[PDB]
Structure formats: C-alpha cells, structure tokens
Design an enzyme around this catalytic site. Structure first.
Site, short mmCIF file in Angstrom:
data_model
loop_
_atom_site.label_atom_id
_atom_site.label_comp_id
_atom_site.label_asym_id
_atom_site.label_seq_id
_atom_site.Cartn_x
_atom_site.Cartn_y
_atom_site.Cartn_z
N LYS A 133 -3.51 4.49 -23.76
CA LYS A 133 -4.18 5.62 -23.13
C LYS A 133 -3.74 6.91 -23.81
CE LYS A 133 -0.52 5.74 -19.64
NZ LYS A 133 -0.20 5.93 -18.20
N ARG A 154 -2.70 11.05 -23.47
CA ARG A 154 -2.14 12.08 -22.60
C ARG A 154 -3.23 13.11 -22.31
NH1 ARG A 154 -0.78 8.73 -25.36
NH2 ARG A 154 -0.78 10.14 -27.17
N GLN A 158 -6.01 15.12 -24.84
CA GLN A 158 -6.09 14.61 -26.21
C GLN A 158 -7.49 14.13 -26.58
OE1 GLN A 158 -2.68 12.00 -27.12
NE2 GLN A 158 -1.85 13.87 -28.02
N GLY A 177 6.36 17.96 -27.77
CA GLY A 177 6.57 16.62 -27.28
C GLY A 177 5.42 16.08 -26.46
N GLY A 192 2.44 15.43 -27.76
CA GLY A 192 1.59 14.65 -28.64
C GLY A 192 0.53 15.49 -29.34
N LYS A 193 0.93 16.62 -29.92
CA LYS A 193 -0.04 17.47 -30.62
C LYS A 193 -0.54 16.85 -31.91
CE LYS A 193 2.19 21.23 -30.21
NZ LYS A 193 2.76 22.45 -30.85
N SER A 194 0.35 16.22 -32.69
CA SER A 194 0.00 15.79 -34.04
C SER A 194 -1.12 14.75 -34.04
CB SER A 194 1.23 15.20 -34.71
OG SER A 194 2.32 16.10 -34.67
N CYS A 197 9.21 27.09 -4.87
CA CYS A 197 9.28 25.95 -5.76
C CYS A 197 9.44 26.40 -7.21
CB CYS A 197 8.03 25.08 -5.60
SG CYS A 197 7.79 23.84 -6.89
N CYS A 246 12.35 22.56 -3.14
CA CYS A 246 11.35 21.76 -2.43
C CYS A 246 11.99 20.72 -1.52
CB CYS A 246 10.41 21.10 -3.44
SG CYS A 246 8.88 22.00 -3.76
ZN LIG Z 1 9.17 22.20 -6.06
#
Ligand SMILES: [Zn+2]
Ligand SMILES: [Zn+2]
Lengths: 530, 530
Positions: B29, B31, B34, B54, B56-58, B391, B416
DNA sequence: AGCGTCGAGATCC
DNA sequence: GGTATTGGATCTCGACGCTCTCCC
DNA sequence: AGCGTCGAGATCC
DNA sequence: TGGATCTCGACGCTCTCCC
C-alpha cells in the site's frame, strides 16, 4: 516616506554646520542632487535608504554627518576593496578613519578596539565587513560600550541591496545586520545602494529590522552625457578603423573606455588598436590580478589612453575625466548599459556615450543569457532602445527607470534629439515571406539560424532553403536585419535555443503573433528615415 | 484544485502504477498522498509535494520513472542525499546514477553515452543544480535525450532552496527555470519537507512554472507519544532520570537524546557510559570517520543511545527508534518536530519526551541573537512547553497552520492523558513586584540576570537589589520560573542582550506591555491545575 | 569584563 | 551595683573559576 | 547543427 | 582537350560575462 522635497532646505539648526564641513573639510561648493536631503534626514535621527547612481556621491551623505557628530560612524562594507577606496579618499581629505577585516593584523585590531572605547579618540569612521558583526563577540562588546558612552550613534550599511535574493548581489552575512538596530536603537541607520527595487528595499528594511524608513531615489539623468547609437560595421577591420578615427579625432589625448562583449573581443580589439598606434589595454576576468591592477594603474595615470574592457572593469571606477565610453557591442540590459556608459564624465563636464548596434550581438547575448529567467526580456529592451530612431535616449531611459521625465529635458544631448525626418514603412509582406521560408525549412526538418533565414531571404545560402517568389527588398543588409529584429521583439518571430557540446545557439521560429497574419487587413509598420 | 479528486485508480496508468508498485518496490500500500502525487505527475502535470522527512518522498518520483519509457532527471542540492537514494535503488536493482562535482571523467562519458543511448536501462540521473547551470555538455545530452522522447520527467528535490526565506537557500536553484523553458513537455515534480506560502510562490516563480498543483501531507504521526517533563535542577539527578527511562521502558531499544551544545552531548555521553549505557556522542566537530562509525554502531544496535546535537539528522532512516529524549528544548517548533519525528519510523509506537528548563530559554536565546526571528521561534517553543491542558498535536497544528481535530490524538500525548481539572491564577501582583525590582535595578544603574531577578524576588541575592515589601510566594522554584517565563513570552518582561568578550548574555528588563499595568483593573492570568 | 558560587568575617540571640 | 553568649546560626560581604553557546 | 576558409571539380576557352 | 580560379560542400571546436 512623505517626500524628499520637504528636506531640500537649510533652516535646520545643524544646516549651517552642515555647510561649514561641506565647503571646509570636503571642499565642495554645492551639494550634488539628493545629498542635502539625505544628510538632513540622517541628522534628524531617521533611518534613510538612498538609491543613487554610482559616482553621484553616496559616500558623502554618511561621511559628512560623521564630522558633524561626536564620536564615530560604523560603516558596513561587503568588500575590502571598497573600504580601501573610501579610506584612501578620507586620508587625502584628512579625516581619521580605520578598517577592520577578516585577516587584519592582530594588533591593528587591538588598536581599533582601544580607539573605539577611547574617550577622546579622533577616529571618525570605522569600516567593517558583515562577519565582524556576525561572528566577533569582542567587536560587538566594544560597539556596545561605545554606544553606551554616546560615541557610537551612526550606522551606515553599504550595498543594502545585498540583503535580498532579488538583488543582483546577495550576501548571507547580511541577514545578521538587523542586530544593529536591535542593539543600538538610538543609532540612526542609513542604507546606500546604486540599484534597488521596491521589493529589494522592502526586503532590506525587513532584514535590518527598521520600522519607518525614508526612501530617496536620485535621478538617472546625467546632463553632461551625449547618448548616440551607431551601426556596427560588418567588417571588423573597418570597425576598428572607425574607432581609431574617433580616438585620434574628437578624443585625441582623452581617456576612455571601450566596452566589449567577450574576453576575446577585448583582447583582439586591444591588439588592433595597439597595432594602429593607440595606447590601449585589455581588461577582463581571466586576466591575472596583477595584470588587472597594472592596467587600471596605467589607465588612471593616463599612460594608457583607452581601456578595452568587459563588465569585469567596474572596480571602484572613480576616474572623473573619461571623455568617451564606446560600446563595441550592446550591453545585455538597459541597467548594464546605463551603469557602463555612466563611467564617462564623472567630472560633470561633457562626455560622449557611443553604442554600436549589430544584428549578431543580439543572438550572442541571447544565447548568453539563456540561464537568466528575464535575460531575454532585458536583452530585448536593450534591442528596442537600439532600434529606436525617433525617441530621445533620455526618454527611453526614464521609461526603463519608471522615472517622471520632461520631453525637453534632454536639451540637445542625444543623437535622436539633434535630427519630421522619419516616416513609416509597411513590412507585412516581408513577414509573410519570412514565415514562408521558415515553413519550407521546417518541412525539410531544418533549423534556421538568423543568418540562414536572412540568406534565404537574400537568395544565398543553401538552395533548398530558398522559397520561390520570395525576393528581398532592395535595401542595405542592415535594414533587413533591423526588420528581422523588429519581428523578433514584436513576437512574430521567436528565439529557439539549442544546447550543443561547446556552445549554445539561437534559431528563429514562428512566433506567437504570426497567426495574426492570417487576416489580410493585418498590417505591421516600422519607422525608417525618409 | 485539491488532491482528493486525484485519489482514484480508474486512470489508464493506474494498472501499471499498482503492478509496478507491488512488483518492483514490493510495497502493498501507499502512504497518504503518494498515489495522488503519482497520478498528477503521471497526468504529465507539474506538482509540488510538501511531505515530512521519512514519509516516503523519493518514491513519488522514482515509481513513475519505471512506469515511463526512458529516464528521469533528479535535481539534488547535496551529494549525500544522492548517495542515499542510489543505495536504496541499487538494492532494489533499479539502475540509477549520479553525476556530481568530482565524478570520474569516464563516469561522465559513461553517463553521457547512457543519456544518448536509445535502449539504455538507466532510469534515474541524479545531478546538482550547477550541473545544469555550468555544463554545456550535460545540457546538450539532455536536449538530445528530450528530443528523442526518452527524457520526459524532472524531479527537483528541496524546492524550498529557491527562496532566501526558505530554511535552506541555494543560489544555484535560480538557474533551474531553464528546464521548463527548454523542456516544457517534460513533467516537473518538486519535493520538499518544509515550505511556506512564501517559499512555494518563490520556488514556483524561480522554476518558471505558471501552473502548479500543491499537495501538502499532514504533519501528524499517530504512533508518536509527545510528552514534556520538568528539567531537574540537579544534573546528576537528571542523568539518573534518563538512566531510569533507558533501563526501564526502553530496555534494549534504540534511541536519540538531543542536546543543546556539543560538550553537553559529551558530558551526557560520559555520564551514561559510566552508568552502564552504550551511548555515543554525535556533533559537527567530530572527525568524519567518527560520525560514520557512530552511525554504524547505532544502526547495528551496538550503541543503544545516540547523544547528539542538531548535526545528527543526516539521512536518518533507522525505523526502530523507540524514544527521542530532548535533554534541552529545541530552538524552534520546526526543529523540535523534525528531531522528534526520527522516532517510530517503523510506524510502531514511540515516545518523544522533552525536558523543559528555565535556563535553557536563555541559553538558546543568547545563541540565536543573530537570527532575526530566533527569539520568536524560541518563545513559540517555550509556549508549547508551558501548556498543561491543550493537546500537543493541536499546538503543532497551530504551528503548521493545519486543520486539526482535537480528539484525533487519541490518548497519544501527555496532556490528553490527564482527562475542568485546571483553573486560572491571577499573577498580576507578582508582575508588579518584579517590575519594582527592575525599576530599582535601573535606577541604581544595575543589570539583572534572570537568576538575579529571582534572588531579589526571594529576598536573597544582593541586598541593594531587593525591594522593600516584595515577598515571593511560597511555591517551588519551578513555579516562580514559570511565572517569569510567562511574563517574558507575554512581553511584560523583555530580554536585553549584552555582548561581552567571551559570551552573549541575557538580562531581564521591563517589557513593552508593562505600561498596561498602569490600569489597576489589568489582570494577567496563567493556567494551573487544581 | 561579568555571572554564579562559596567561604571568612562579622553581627545577633 | 549593674548585664551581659570557649556558640550556634544567620547574613553579608568580598574574592574567585568559566566564559568559549547549532548548522551548513 | 553552424560559419568560414579551402580543397575538389568542373565546364569553358 | 588539358587545367583556371570561384562557386559550392565538409565538419572543427565552437564562442558566453561575471556575479
Ligand atoms: Zn493529545
Ligand atoms: Zn534627447
């Protein structure tokens, strides 16, 4: 912010003192344009950005308030050489000024620190590079001590356009300079630049952490300059002889600059002038620095009459008696031509700026500026300036500068103003013929250079490229070239760049507006002389 | 005009996309965003993708390369990112090459020959922007490949490098527009981790693209647990808390401890090692071999903890980083997000634990005094730290200007996990007392450090600095420090930097908004727990 | 030059 | 006739080591 | 692909 | 019926500066 005109007065309390110094320390009878306004604004404790052409007297606007003030003025200068220029002028004038740079003697810097803190130091102007502010804690500490002691109250930032990426030159060091206004709010800041935009000045104001800034822009106009555009001869030796006729004629014994497109152009033109008895010297970047300095020194001493130069020449050009600036080839933009021609007549006496317009220089420069996003645009603006035979050169420059101008302000000082005697020529059929030639070429899968297109127009060149029934008008070749250039800048023809192993070349292709020719009522007119 | 419209798989290429994905890349699959970027790119339309490091750009430009016929040109500012991509691609077996400043001359002929070659298996060419700007040969080979319909894809990594206002600024990028001008039929994808509205508009301008899809991925990383803890006053106690964390919940799990200064990393590494932890220090001043050895030992899990300054972050692909502890707060929200996000790249659960100390504010503030916005991003970080109700994901969303849902965090941050149970405390009189102390200091011509201010508040310190009747509340020192920090970021107190020989130091002075205390009804409230 | 820390030496109860 | 600590805390001063801070 | 000298090569005288 | 100088064509490294 409001208007420079409000400050062109001398009723201020210091205004008398401004004037003592002007005539006494600097020995100048009158103020140059915008000098008094900038000086008054500085003495009022008000951050000011001054845009002024090179050689108009920018340095005075921050040097004079330094002797009007109490302690010293801090000047930030990107390059060591500009600092040396100002220091030489100041030592000659008798003003005590010093300079700190990256690798300066360790004990010169200790002396500078002691002078900075000193209570009765005669030091009046300190010139530093932006890393001295950014990286030296000791220098910042001494600046802070001087500021608390009311001996440091003035900041001058040279090349303020270096803050913005959109300026020609950008220095990362400059993004530190804002600390100055933050650390010494009571010190008034002046930014000096020859060339800047609204975007560049607003960026610099952002970087320098300035809230409200007066912005004074000097006029482009140099009344003593005579602007002329001449046809660049096809024969190179004929061109060299014409240049020698000018130099031995109008400019016998007078110093001058010949601006050239390429380093080889500068060397060849210098060689030709030398062989014809002219004391000329070539200047370009590929020369050794010793060679560069020697050529500059010999020209300034008038041992060399002519300096044949590329854009590399421009280091601290302060020569006031440059009687002629000749462009062997057109500059790449109106900006560059203005700056290069403006080195003539710094003494405010009459000087001539003569430009030679050649069809092929357009494509040399276009292939050249292919990496610049607006290079073609500013080149075509230059081309249009060259093509014009009616409008005043000063009027065109004013349009370029977005400067309000008066038609009768040129006042006999350009070639078009001294000659109506022109008429309009209908050139639509020439456009249709050229488009036919281009279509024949593209069907044969042939790319046409401007030379191939004009030759096919004239019936020379490759036979297959010729078009049946296309006969060129009985005009000199320059007229056909001018017609093609007009079609190019008018977008009936377009440039198509090709990248090859050793060179980038320009082809001509069917332009966007060529479809307008489908209608026969379409007409295209160019002005010619009658 | 929005990516969801492109979140489909009914396109003609959609079959080729999914087959190649599952077969060549062996990923079942995609991300988020993409496939959408791939569809827009595959639709032959220039797209700018903003996606965290991190994420998954490439892949979004590597996959369409194998979907297409010839090769894809990738522009990369730094050689190291290129090595990273080349190692991944070679492991899979996709033929990709890199041309760099110092590449073997015969590597360059092989690359040129592959470019011209008609049936070359080469799929990705990685070059730096100067390769475009200065190499006539590379452009000629690119033009030949483009005319042959073998070069139809361009990927520009770090498009934010176009803008000076971008995090990183590269002058080379202003040449890159030539690509679209020379290869309009080639589709362009721009890749960046970090970008603003200003940067993307600048980059779009620079690359000469007048039409751009813009896909921005969410900042959110659901697996990351965000926590802020009080930084202990005692250094040895802090080291013990860290050892309790590491030997406890994170036994045998790899992690990073981010540190403010290089010796801090060194001191912490020595302390952890002497307590039995396999830890390694990482900072810029290390020899390059030391950096690679440390990275290798950490990746092999021989070193459990890497104690690092911001220098660590180069191509961090370790997926099993279970904890990132901030020994000191980052200088900005941007930096803290990037540094914490190295945890849990495997998408399994991970912890980001931050230690908030009063003195770190001023350490970082003095460090960033040269950055024009350094104090501002530091204070934003401080405000994140001061918050005890909201949060953490909501605070990050405010920083990123991203639309967020409060309950999407789902028990995954410390605030939270506590649920009202808070209330507001009026601390105006404390501000008045501190301002009295400040007024007495400035009248006595004395400069107060935050420690000096707290001592005068508590009735300790120099007797002369104390104000009659000012008694500090009976609260832990952390609470008085938090009250002062609130006054500082609320600008009732301000930092006054002083530059000395060896250091830049912070004093506290009366802030801009202190005049607001003139109204007797004025109130300043800080939130506390009940 | 300056901050932060820490004994000696006063004073008191 | 004269009275207030061979102690026990406490200020309250003044000397006296670090300082050197990210990232390209 | 491109501009320019310079061989190659004709037909004519 | 031989070779004249005068037209092509060929393909060489190319011709672009400095900020
Ligand atoms: Zn939170
Ligand atoms: Zn005129």
């Amino acid at each position: 912010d409001s208007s420079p005109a409000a400050w062109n007065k001398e009723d201020f309390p210091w205004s008398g003192k401004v004037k003592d110094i002007l005539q006494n320390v600097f020995k100048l009878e009158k103020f140059r344009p915008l000098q008094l306004e900038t000086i008054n604004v500085t003495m009022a404790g008000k951050e000011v950005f001054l845009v002024m052409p090179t050689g108009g007297g920018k340095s005075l606007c921050y040097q004079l308030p330094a002797l009007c003030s109490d302690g010293f003025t801090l000047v930030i200068c990107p390059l060591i050489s500009l600092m040396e220029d100002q220091l030489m002028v100041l030592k000659q004038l008798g003003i005590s000024a010093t300079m700190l740079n990256a690798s300066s003697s360790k004990e010169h810097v200790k002396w500078v620190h002691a002078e900075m803190v000193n209570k009765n130091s005669e030091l009046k102007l300190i010139y530093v590079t932006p890393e001295k502010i950014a990286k030296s804690k000791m220098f910042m500490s001494r600046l802070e001590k001087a500021y608390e002691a009311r001996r440091f109250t003035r900041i001058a930032v040279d090349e303020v356009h270096c803050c913005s990426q959109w300026g020609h030159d950008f220095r990362p060091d400059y993004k530190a300079l804002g600390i100055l206004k933050r650390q010494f709010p009571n010190a008034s800041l002046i930014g000096l630049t020859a060339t800047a935009t609204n975007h560049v000045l607003t960026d610099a104001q952002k970087i320098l952490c300035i809230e409200k800034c007066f912005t004074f822009t000097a006029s482009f106009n140099r009344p003593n300059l005579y602007y002329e555009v001449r046809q660049k001869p096809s024969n190179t030796e004929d061109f060299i002889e014409d240049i020698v006729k000018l130099i031995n004629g109008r400019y016998k014994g007078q110093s001058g600059i010949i601006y050239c497109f390429s380093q080889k152009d500068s060397e060849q033109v210098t060689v030709s002038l030398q062989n014809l008895g002219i004391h000329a010297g070539a200047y370009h970047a590929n020369l050794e620095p010793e060679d560069k300095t020697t050529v500059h020194r010999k020209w300034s001493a008038n041992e060399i009459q002519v300096v044949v130069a590329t854009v590399a020449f421009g280091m601290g050009i302060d020569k006031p008696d440059v009687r002629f600036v000749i462009h062997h080839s057109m500059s790449k933009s109106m900006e560059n031509y203005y700056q290069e021609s403006g080195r003539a007549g710094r003494d405010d006496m009459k000087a001539d700026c003569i430009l030679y317009y050649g069809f092929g220089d357009i494509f040399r420069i276009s292939s050249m500026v292919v990496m610049e996003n607006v290079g073609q645009q500013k080149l075509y603006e230059m081309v249009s300036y060259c093509q014009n035979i009616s409008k005043c050169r000063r009027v065109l420059m004013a349009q370029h500068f977005d400067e309000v101008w008066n038609s009768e302000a040129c006042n006999k000082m350009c070639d078009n103003c001294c000659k109506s005697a022109f008429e309009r020529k209908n050139i639509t059929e020439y456009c249709r013929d050229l488009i036919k030639i281009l279509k024949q070429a593209e069907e044969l899968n042939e790319k046409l250079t401007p030379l191939k297109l004009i030759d096919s127009w004239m019936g020379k060149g490759a036979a297959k490229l010729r078009v049946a029934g296309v006969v060129a008008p009985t005009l000199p070749r320059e007229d056909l070239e001018k017609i093609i250039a007009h079609f190019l800048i008018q977008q009936y023809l377009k440039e198509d760049y090709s990248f090859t192993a050793y060179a980038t070349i320009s082809y001509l292709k069917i332009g966007p507006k060529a479809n307008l020719l489908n209608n026969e009522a379409h007409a295209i007119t160019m002005q010619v002389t009658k």
